Design a binder for this molecule. Sequence first.
Ligand code: HEM
Length: 136
Amino acid sequence: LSADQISTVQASFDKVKGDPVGILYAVFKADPSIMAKFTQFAGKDLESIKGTAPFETHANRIVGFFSKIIGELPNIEADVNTFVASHKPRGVTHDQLNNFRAGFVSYMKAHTDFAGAEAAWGATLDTFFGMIFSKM
Ligand code: HEM
């Protein structure tokens, strides 16, 4: 993960970072068991809560932190540590994490011309999820 790839990803992310709700929707849609961990969304129709204020609040926090991480590549260790601290005790599994990844990439493919940033994103996400999976 070098500056060339980092600059590519960050340019790519800048195009979509204003749509937190869209990104979280794509993740929840890829894996409903992620949605079922939120007391505020469990048992509801995803298509119906997508436009409500609670969804947006959550989406802004979650994609907000991801944004922090993308902004500081590649010095992400301390933030991954924080993520693991808050999420390890909620029982998040490797499956769910990989579905988060899949949902995000699906979002990125359906909203941008992704083919030009795909290898850089691959490097980034392999690095990030590589660190998470070593810790939880
Ligand atoms: C994919 C599996 C994941 C599951 C099952 C999960 C689950 C949750 C749950 C249950 C909450 C608490 C919401 C609330 O009580 O209001 C939450 C909050 C949060 N999540 Fe995750 N999350 C996942 C992935 C991620 C990822 C990849 C990030 C990185 C951006 C992230 C960042 C956050 C942040 C910043 C919060 C707010 C602070 C907190 O309460 O932890 N989550 N998530």
